C-alpha cells in the first residue's frame, strides 16, 4: 500500500536520526567508510561504541544490507541497556529512529510503527515541543560524528553540530574531541592552518587518557614545526594503541612525515594484523614505500647504484604489491588505482599504466571527487607520457565537469589554457580547443571572452547542444 507507506514516511521524516541528516550515499565510498568504522570499534579505540554502531547500521542499509543493519542496531541497544541508565529511553531515540526507518525500507510497516510509537511516547512524557523529536546535546554530538565521517562536503555542518552541543556543555570531554577533530579537518598542501591547535590542546586536557585525540595533537604540532613536542605525545600513546588500527595509521603518518620509514611501517604492520582486509592500510603502506624510494632517488640525483639501486628495486616492488593488495580488497579504492598507474608510468611501463587507468576510468559507483582525480591523473599521463594533447584536453575538461572547485582547479584551468592556445595557434578552427577555452573562461566568470569562443565553436558545429546551452546561459548576462 503506497497510501500507508506515505503516511508513515511523513512521521519518519520528523525523527532525528541518520536517515534525516542528509547523509548521501553518493558522497562516500561505502566499503571504505565501513572499514573505517570497523577499525574504530576495535579494542575500545573510542569510548563511544553507541554512535559507531548506529552509524554502521545506516551504512549497512546504504549497502543494501538491511538484515545486517538490524544486527548493528541490536548491538546499539545492548550498549544502551548494559549501562543500566536512568536515561535509557532518551539515549535510545536515535537507535529507535534508525530501527523505524530500516523496518520501513524492509516493508515492515507495523514494526516501524512500534518504534515511531516508542519515540512518540518518550517525547510526550518529557514534554518535548516536537511530537517525534527531543533536542539534546548528545544527539547533536552524534550528528556531528556522522557528518564528519561523510567527508569534506560535511565538515562545516559537523562543526556547527559540535558547536551546538558545546553551547550547552562547553567543557564536555566528548564534544571537545569532536569539535577539535573537525577544525583539524578544516585546517587541512595549503598552506596548512593551525586554527585547530587551541581546540586540540583543550580536548587533550579534558581527555588525559585518550590516545585518539593525542595523535591528532601530535600531527598538528608536527605541522607547525614543533615535532619534538609532538613526538612526546606519540611516545605517550604507543603502548596503548598496539591493537588499535585506526589510531596506529595516524601515528604511522607522524613517523612517515619525519621520514622515519621503518617506524612508520612497524606501526602499519601492527594495524594490518588487527584488520587484514583493509584497503586503506595497504595503500598507506604503499605510500610509505614510495616516499622512501623518492627520497633515495633525490639523494642520488636519480642515478642510484649499489645497495641504493637494490633498495630502490625492492621499494618499487613492495609499493606495487600493496597498491594491488588495496585494489584486491576494495575494487572501489580509487586512490590505489591512480597511485599504481602513476608508478607504472614513471617506470615507463605505459601498457601497464594504461590497463590500470582504463579500469579506473570505468569505475561507476565511486564519488565525483574520485572521478575528478582519476580524470586529472589520466590527463597528466596523456599530456606528459603519451604526448597526446587532444586526449589530455578531453580529460582535463572531464575533471572540471565533474568537480569545478577543488585544489586541482588552478592546475586544470592552466593546462587547458596552454594546450588549447597552442592548438589554436596551429588551427584556428579546432573545435575541441575553442570549446575548452569557452568552458574555462565561463567558469572563471570572463563571460565576453567565453561567448566569443563558444560562438566560434558553434559556427563550426551548429547543432552541438553543449555549445547552444553554454551560449544560452552566457546571454543571461
Curated annotation (Swiss-Prot):
Changing residue 380 to E: Reduces binding to RNA and DNA and impairs antiviral activity. SMART domains: TPR. The record marks 284 as: Interaction with the 5'-triphosphate group of PPP-RNA. One of its GO terms (molecular function) is RNA binding. Coiled coil: none annotated. The keyword Nucleus does not apply. One of its GO terms (cellular component) is plasma membrane. Changing residue 32 to A: No effect on RNA-binding but changes size profile of RNA bound. Reduces PPP-RNA-binding. Changing residue 305 to A: Reduces RNA-binding. Changing residue 185 to H/A: Abolishes RNA-binding. It is found in: Cell projection, Ruffle membrane. Pfam families: TPR_10 (PF13374), TPR_12 (PF13424), TPR_2 (PF07719), TPR_8 (PF13181). Changing residue 284 to E: Abolishes RNA-binding. Changing residue 149 to R: Reduces RNA-binding. It comes from the Eukaryota. Changing residue 256 to E: Abolishes PPP-RNA-binding. Monomer. Interacts with MAP3K7 and the components of the IKK core complex CHUK, IKBKB and IKBKG; the interaction synergizes the recruitment of IKK to MAP3K7 and enhances IKK phosphorylation. Belongs to the IFIT family. This is Interferon-induced protein with tetratricopeptide repeats 5. It comes from Homo sapiens. The lineage of its organism: Eukaryota, Metazoa, Chordata, Craniata, Vertebrata.
Amino acid at each position: 500500500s503506497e497510501i500507508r507507506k506515505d503516511t508513515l514516511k511523513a512521521i519518519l521524516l520528523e525523527l532525528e536520526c541518520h536517515f534525516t541528516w542528509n547523509l548521501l550515499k553518493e558522497d562516500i565510498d561505502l566499503f571504505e567508510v565501513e572499514d573505517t568504522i570497523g577499525q574504530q570499534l576495535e579494542f575500545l579505540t573510542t569510548k563511544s561504541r553507541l554512535a559507531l554502531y548506529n552509524l554502521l547500521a545506516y551504512v549497512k542499509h546504504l549497502k543494501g544490507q538491511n538484515k545486517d543493519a538490524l544486527e548493528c542496531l541490536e548491538q546499539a541497544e545492548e550498549i544502551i541497556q548494559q549501562e543500566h541508565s536512568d536515561k535509557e529511553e532518551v539515549r535510545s531515540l536515535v537507535t529507535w529512529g534508525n530501527y523505524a526507518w530500516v523496518y520501513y525500507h524492509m516493508d515492515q510497516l507495523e514494526e516501524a510503527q512500534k518504534y515511531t510509537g516508542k519515540i512518540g511516547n518518550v517525547c510526550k512524557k518529557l514534554s518535548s515541543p516536537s511530537n517525534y523529536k527531543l533536542e539534546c546535546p548528545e544527539t547533536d554530538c552524534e550528528k556531528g560524528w556522522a557528518l564528519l565521517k561523510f567527508g569534506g562536503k560535511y565538515y562545516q555542518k559537523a562543526k556547527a553540530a559540535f558547536e551546538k552541543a558545546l553551547e550547552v556543555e562547553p567543557d564536555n570531554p566528548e564534544f571537545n574531541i569532536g569539535y577539535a577533530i573537525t577544525v583539524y579537518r578544516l585546517d587541512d598542501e595549503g598552506s596548512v592552518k593551525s586554527f585547530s591547535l587551541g581546540p586540540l590542546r583543550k580536548a587533550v586536557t579534558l581527555n588525559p587518557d585518550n590516545s585518539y585525540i593525542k595523535v591528532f595533537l601530535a600531527l598538528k604540532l608536527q605541522d607547525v614545526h614543533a615535532e619534538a613536542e609532538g613526538e612526546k605525545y606519540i611516545e605517550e600513546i604507543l603502548d596503548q594503541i598496539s591493537s588499535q588500527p585506526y589510531v596506529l595509521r595516524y601515528a604511522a603518518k607522524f613517523y612517515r612525515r619525519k621520514n622515519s620509514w621503518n617506524k612508520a611501517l612497524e606501526l602499519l604492520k601492527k594495524a594490518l594484523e588487527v584488520t587484514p582486509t583493509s584497503s586503506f592500510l595497504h595503500h598507506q603502506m604503499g605510500l610509505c614505500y614510495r616516499a622512501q624510494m623518492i627520497q633515495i632517488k633525490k639523494a642520488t640525483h636519480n642515478r642510484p647504484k649499489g645497495k641504493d639501486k637494490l633498495k630502490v628495486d625492492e621499494l618499487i616492488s613492495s609499493a606495487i604489491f600493496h597498491f594491488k593488495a588495496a585494489m584486491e580488497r576494495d575494487s572501489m579504492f580509487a586512490f590505489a588505482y591512480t597511485d599504481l598507474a602513476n608508478m607504472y608510468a614513471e617506470g615507463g611501463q605505459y601498457s601497464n599504466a594504461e590497463d590500470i587507468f582504463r579500469k579506473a576510468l570505468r569505475l561507476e559507483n565511486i564519488t565525483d571527487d574520485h572521478k575528478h582525480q582519476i580524470h586529472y591523473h589520466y590527463g597528466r599521463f596523456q599530456e606528459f607520457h603519451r604526448k597526446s594533447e587532444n586526449t589530455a584536453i578531453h580529460h582535463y575538461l572531464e575533471a572540471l565537469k565533474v568537480k569545478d572547485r577543488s585544489p586541482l582547479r588552478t592546475k586544470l584551468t592552466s593546462a587547458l589554457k596552454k594546450l588549447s592556445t597552442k592548438r589554436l595557434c596551429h588551427n584556428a578552427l579546432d573545435v575541441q580547443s575553442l570549446s575548452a577555452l569557452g568552458f574555462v573562461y565561463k567558469l572563471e566568470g570572463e563571460k565576453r571572452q567565453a561567448a566569443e569562443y563558444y560562438e566560434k565553436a558553434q559556427k563550426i558545429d551548429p547543432e552541438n547542444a553543449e555549445f547552444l546551452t553554454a551560449l544560452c546561459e552566457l546571454r543571461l548576462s
